Amino acid sequence: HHHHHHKDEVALLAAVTLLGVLLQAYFSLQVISARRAFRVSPPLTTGPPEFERVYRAQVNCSEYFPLFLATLWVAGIFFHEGAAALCGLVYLFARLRYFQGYARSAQLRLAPLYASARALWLLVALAALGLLAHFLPAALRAALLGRLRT
Amino acid sequence: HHHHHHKDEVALLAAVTLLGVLLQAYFSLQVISARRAFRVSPPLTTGPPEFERVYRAQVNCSEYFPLFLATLWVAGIFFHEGAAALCGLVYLFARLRYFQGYARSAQLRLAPLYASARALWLLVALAALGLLAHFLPAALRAALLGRLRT
Amino acid sequence: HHHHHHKDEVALLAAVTLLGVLLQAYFSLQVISARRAFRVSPPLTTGPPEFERVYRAQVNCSEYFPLFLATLWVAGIFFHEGAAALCGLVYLFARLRYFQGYARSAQLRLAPLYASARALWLLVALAALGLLAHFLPAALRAALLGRLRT
Numbered sequence A, B, C: 001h002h003h004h005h006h007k008d009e010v011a012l013l014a015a016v017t018l019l020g021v022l023l024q025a026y027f028s029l030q031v032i033s034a035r036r037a038f039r040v041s042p043p044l045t046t047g048p049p050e051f052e053r054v055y056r057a058q059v060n061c062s063e064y065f066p067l068f069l070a071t072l073w074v075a076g077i078f079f080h081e082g083a084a085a086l087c088g089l090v091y092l093f094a095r096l097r098y099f100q101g102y103a104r105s106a107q108l109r110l111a112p113l114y115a116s117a118r119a120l121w122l123l124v125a126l127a128a129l130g131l132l133a134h135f136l137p138a139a140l141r142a143a144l145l146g147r148l149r150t
């Protein structure tokens, strides 16, 4: 300690992060369940198309997961916490729909993949705008002071 | 700067995080070593069951790795740093045992997969309790003030 | 709020993190593009060696991505922000070269894999040194006070 804490600046981000982990846990338990239904034992990640879709829906979500966390936290700190958290929920809800769709059909992964991309791209844009607002003033000022010499 | 820092609030979490990275590095060097022993060259992630087990033990640890980091940090900030760090070590030690076991035998991955799940689930529960202690008082208060109007 | 913020302690780390996410996004759009060129539809991650190389270059970068983020942030907080950010850029530029090389040829992945390992290992070493500078003084002091009793 510290007679102050900054938890109240990031608790929405932390809540959306936790929801994210729970969703990834669900995807994982669904793969375990597909291994049982389709008798596909580790090591070994191939089997019927219907087992491969569930496996692949989960692996896809897992590989985008750190991009989402990174971008969430940077947008939430540098741009606005509520906005970032809100895009976060939208991304996670689109990922649930991606996973459920892909499991039924490769073609049904597409509409929600696109919803999830719009939401991550918006987080990236908010992260860039916040970082630009952080760095640009001081860089322009320094450039200008440099020219000031009559 | 800053005439204060908050490093002393997260240095255990940071130490367990670093240990985590070193463990994932080890798993990776062990896959490189299995590629050599079994003459399985990239691209290409199939070969003898014994090469596939090492590959798969590493990929499994890598896909749960961000869930562990996310949950560690949220539990450590919102619930209690020492507790979270301690569950963290237990999870990582169980992941070493998972990797070593899975390499010998698919069946030997199971006991430590279950130890690692208990430890991650405890981190998730501590993260949820901390977030609940953060949000519930103010939400109940607002609900109640709403009713106060005689 | 808070009448102070600690954004100015981590904005380089946040910028390098954002650049990292954009690079991983690029790798992903390149896999989508290889699926089109080589007519390899999900689920399903095998096809011509040239499709498998692009797929695998991306999956490899994605699995090291959280190790990089973890290590970046710990080195940047506990050791020195500019140094960590700089090793960060070097790692990311080596990852671009890895991806481009691996896509052309499995053998062309090697020189930049090694550049990217040197840069991550340096981040790990800076993270360890910072954590050692944080923990060692107080541990040695406590050990010594323990002996002090005549």
Ligand SMILES: CCCCCCCCCCCCO[C@H]1O[C@H](CO)[C@@H](O[C@H]2O[C@@H](CO)[C@@H](O)[C@H](O)[C@@H]2O)[C@H](O)[C@H]1O
Residues within 6 Å of the ligand: A067, A106, A107, A108, A110, A113, A114, A117, A120, A121, A124, C025, C028, C029, C031, C032, C033, C034, C035, C036, C039, C040, C041, C042, C043
């Ligand atoms: C930070 C943001 C990261 C960005 C990630 C980008 C993801 C979102 C943009 C996705 C657009 C790509 O979607 C695209 O993928 C594949 C082509 O290579 C195709 O995917 C298709 O594969 C088929 C056969 O090839 C079938 O298995 C499927 O039903 C599908 O129609 C789609 O017909 C196409 O629409």
Ligand SMILES: CCCCCCCCCCCCO[C@H]1O[C@H](CO)[C@@H](O[C@H]2O[C@@H](CO)[C@@H](O)[C@H](O)[C@@H]2O)[C@H](O)[C@H]1O
Residues within 6 Å of the ligand: A025, A028, A029, A031, A032, A033, A034, A035, A036, A039, A040, A041, A042, A043, B067, B106, B107, B108, B110, B113, B114, B117, B120, B121, B124
């Ligand atoms: C946040 C927490 C995330 C939660 C992750 C959950 C992981 C921990 C719970 C794991 C329980 C699942 O374990 C389960 O997996 C597989 C079934 O689908 C089976 O795994 C089995 O596969 C076989 C044949 O099918 C063999 O390759 C193995 O020896 C094994 O016995 C197990 O017999 C079962 O016990």
Ligand SMILES: CCCCCCCCCCCCO[C@H]1O[C@H](CO)[C@@H](O[C@H]2O[C@@H](CO)[C@@H](O)[C@H](O)[C@@H]2O)[C@H](O)[C@H]1O
Residues within 6 Å of the ligand: B025, B028, B029, B031, B032, B033, B034, B035, B036, B039, B040, B041, B042, B043, C067, C106, C107, C108, C110, C113, C114, C117, C120, C121, C124
């Ligand atoms: C925190 C840091 C994490 C550390 C990650 C370590 C990555 C960096 C060290 C990499 C060194 C390993 O590189 C090594 O991989 C493979 C052996 O198993 C081989 O990779 C080789 O595989 C071949 C046939 O087997 C071909 O597909 C390739 O052209 C290549 O030459 C290399 O001949 C070797 O040089």
Ligand SMILES: N[C@H](CCC(=O)N[C@@H](CS)C(=O)NCC(=O)O)C(=O)O
Residues within 6 Å of the ligand: A028, A029, A031, A032, A035, A042, A043, A044, A045, A055, B056, B057, B059, B060, B063, B109, B113
């Ligand atoms: N990637 C998944 C996640 C679901 C999961 O973690 N399953 C556990 C128990 S079956 C496991 O050890 N998977 C083996 C593996 O990933 O190779 C899988 O393919 O199985």
Ligand SMILES: N[C@H](CCC(=O)N[C@@H](CS)C(=O)NCC(=O)O)C(=O)O
Residues within 6 Å of the ligand: B028, B029, B031, B032, B035, B042, B043, B044, B045, B055, C056, C057, C059, C060, C063, C109, C113
């Ligand atoms: N995922 C592992 C990690 C071990 C590793 O990173 N190996 C390096 C050198 S062999 C690599 O370029 N792997 C190629 C790949 O992942 O496709 C692998 O399958 O090889």
Ligand SMILES: N[C@H](CCC(=O)N[C@@H](CS)C(=O)NCC(=O)O)C(=O)O
Residues within 6 Å of the ligand: A056, A057, A059, A060, A063, A109, A113, C028, C029, C031, C032, C035, C042, C043, C044, C045, C055
């Ligand atoms: N891992 C990549 C990333 C590129 C990507 O995310 N593609 C989207 C649209 S084709 C997808 O749904 N991939 C299906 C999958 O990963 O199984 C892939 O193999 O396709």
Ligand SMILES: CCCCCC/C=C/CCCCCCCC(=O)O
Residues within 6 Å of the ligand: A006, A009, A010, A069, A070, A073, A074, A076, A077, A078, C005, C006, C007, C010, C017, C069, C070, C073
């Ligand atoms: C890899 C995921 C990136 C995680 C980065 C999270 C680190 C945040 C560090 C500074 C937090 C300071 C409190 C917020 C200050 C503010 O909101 O203005």
Ligand SMILES: CCCCCC/C=C/CCCCCCCC(=O)O
Residues within 6 Å of the ligand: A005, A006, A007, A010, A017, A069, A070, A073, B006, B009, B010, B069, B070, B073, B074, B076, B077, B078
């Ligand atoms: C994706 C991994 C999530 C990482 C989130 C880490 C960010 C921490 C930000 C606030 C830290 C403030 C110091 C701790 C305050 C306290 O312990 O009460």
Ligand SMILES: CCCCCC/C=C/CCCCCCCC(=O)O
Residues within 6 Å of the ligand: B005, B006, B007, B010, B017, B069, B070, B073, C006, C009, C010, C069, C070, C073, C074, C076, C077, C078
């Ligand atoms: C999983 C990625 C690990 C992310 C950890 C990032 C959390 C940082 C928390 C404390 C930040 C306090 C501001 C910096 C203090 C300083 O530089 O001395």
Ligand code: NI
Residues within 6 Å of the ligand: A001, A002, A003
């Ligand atoms: Ni005090």
Ligand code: NI
Residues within 6 Å of the ligand: B001, B002, B003
């Ligand atoms: Ni001062």
Ligand code: NI
Residues within 6 Å of the ligand: C001, C002, C003
């Ligand atoms: Ni005030």
Ligand code: NI
Residues within 6 Å of the ligand: A004, A006, B004, B006, C004, C006
């Ligand atoms: Ni402060």
